[PDB]
Design a protein around this ligand. Structure first.
Ligand SMILES: *[C@@H]1O[C@H](CO)[C@@H](O[C@@H]2O[C@H](CO)[C@@H](O)[C@H](O)[C@H]2NC(C)=O)[C@H](O)[C@H]1NC(C)=O
Ligand SMILES: *[C@@H]1O[C@H](CO)[C@@H](O)[C@H](O)[C@H]1NC(C)=O
Ligand SMILES: *[C@@H]1O[C@H](CO)[C@@H](O)[C@H](O)[C@H]1NC(C)=O
Lengths: 49, 50
């Protein structure tokens, strides 16, 4: 016989902060010879990018 | 494509220079030395690496 006002809240995340780190400075830092060594190891850094 | 470095200044040479008197001369030049089973132990520091 009577009406009651109702309201409920919902929470839904959408996106996070995207990150991009270069593999050479992440692993070997500033070592040029380490970069030369990982050049022939594979294309893993391209896959990560 | 790539990344650009930070260019961290120019190479800094530190300042460790002290009196150059070291006990290497009197321990390397001697007419008699210790034996293998009992060797003399000397702590050499507070000078430069000759
Ligand atoms: C349904 O219930 C509400 C809540 O009690 C009624 O609202 C009240 O109405 C009286 C007089 O009509 C007021 O004096 C109150 O202050 C009201 N209260 C609130 C919380 O609003 C409402 O009247 C009811 N519906 C019917 C058709 O009687
Ligand atoms: C290095 O040598 C100079 C000149 O002998 C002297 O003035 C200076 O104090 C030395 N450096 C240090 C750290 O003591
Ligand atoms: C080396 O040994 C000689 C004698 O064996 C000694 O006269 C001299 O002082 C020592 N030191 C140097 C730096 O020649």
């Amino acid at each position: 016989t009577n009406f009651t006002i109702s309201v409920t809240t919902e929470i839904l995340p959408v996106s996070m902060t995207k990150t991009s780190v270069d593999c050479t400075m992440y692993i070997c830092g500033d070592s040029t010879e380490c970069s030369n060594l990982l050049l022939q190891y594979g294309s893993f850094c391209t896959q990560l990018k | 494509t790539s990344n650009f470095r930070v260019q961290p200044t120019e190479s800094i040479v530190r300042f460790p220079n002290i009196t150059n008197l070291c006990p290497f001369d009197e321990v390397f030049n001697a007419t008699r030395f210790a034996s293998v089973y009992a060797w003399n132990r000397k702590r050499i520091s507070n000078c430069v690496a000759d």
